[PDB]
Design a protein around this motif. Structure first.
Motif, PDB file in Angstrom:
ATOM      1  N   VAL A  24      -2.085  -2.956  -3.384  1.00 27.97           N
ATOM      2  CA  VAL A  24      -3.099  -3.503  -2.481  1.00 27.97           C
ATOM      3  C   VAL A  24      -4.312  -2.593  -2.512  1.00 27.97           C
ATOM      4  O   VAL A  24      -5.441  -3.016  -2.268  1.00 27.97           O
ATOM      5  CB  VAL A  24      -2.607  -3.631  -1.017  1.00 27.97           C
ATOM      6  N   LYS A  61      -5.018  -8.917   3.577  1.00 26.88           N
ATOM      7  CA  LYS A  61      -5.527  -7.842   2.743  1.00 26.88           C
ATOM      8  C   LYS A  61      -5.762  -6.582   3.551  1.00 26.88           C
ATOM      9  O   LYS A  61      -5.175  -5.544   3.274  1.00 26.88           O
ATOM     10  CB  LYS A  61      -6.839  -8.249   2.093  1.00 26.88           C
ATOM     11  N   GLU A  64      -2.575  -5.008   4.576  1.00 18.74           N
ATOM     12  CA  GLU A  64      -1.844  -4.278   3.541  1.00 18.74           C
ATOM     13  C   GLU A  64      -2.573  -2.994   3.140  1.00 18.74           C
ATOM     14  O   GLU A  64      -1.926  -1.987   2.862  1.00 18.74           O
ATOM     15  CB  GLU A  64      -1.574  -5.168   2.326  1.00 18.74           C
TER      16      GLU A  64
END
Length: 105
Positions: A24, A61, A64
């Motif tokens: 990520v 997103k 993470e």
């Protein structure tokens, strides 16, 4: 050395190392605390909540990024991540690593 403009090839499944948090942040398991923290920042604003449409994808997103920020450099969150990861990791985040024992044995 990874040229910007990377596109997921047909071999996407094998290109992924199977690890989530590391990737990520755009780094592999070969990163150190230094790499993990900086990559956090670099992406954290890029996927900052205001930059997000109705799709919670960018929120996922940021989540993470902000997660990996701790996990990879944290001995415990990295520990259970490699050990089991499915439960122990998620519960250590929501409940707290030392606390998880409440949901565990």
């Amino acid at each position: 050395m990874r040229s910007p403009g990377m596109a997921d090839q047909r071999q996407r499944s094998l290109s992924t190392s199977g690890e989530s948090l590391y990737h990520v942040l755009g780094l592999d398991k070969n990163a150190t605390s230094d790499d993990i923290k900086k990559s956090y920042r670099k992406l954290a604003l890029k996927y900052h909540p205001d930059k997000n449409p109705d799709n919670p994808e960018a929120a996922d997103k940021f989540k993470e990024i902000n997660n990996a920020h701790a996990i990879l450099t944290d001995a415990t969150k990295r520990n259970i991540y490699d050990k089991y990861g499915s439960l122990g990791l998620y519960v250590a985040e929501q409940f707290g690593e030392e606390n998880v024992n409440t949901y565990f044995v």
